[PDB]
Amino acid sequence: ENFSGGCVAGYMRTPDGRCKPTFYQ
C-alpha cells in the first residue's frame, strides 16, 4: 500500500519505485 511516495534522507530513491537505505559504514 503506497509503497513509494515521500522517502526520508539517506534512502536512495530507486529508479523503479522503492526506497533503500545507504548507511555504508
Side-chain angles (χ1 to χ4, degrees), residues 4-25:
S4 309
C7 220
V8 298
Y11 273 34
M12 264 277 176
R13 285 98 64 131
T14 21
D16 198 78
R18 232 189 235 148
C19 264
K20 254 76 183 102
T22 170
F23 50 90
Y24 229 147
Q25 250 273 19

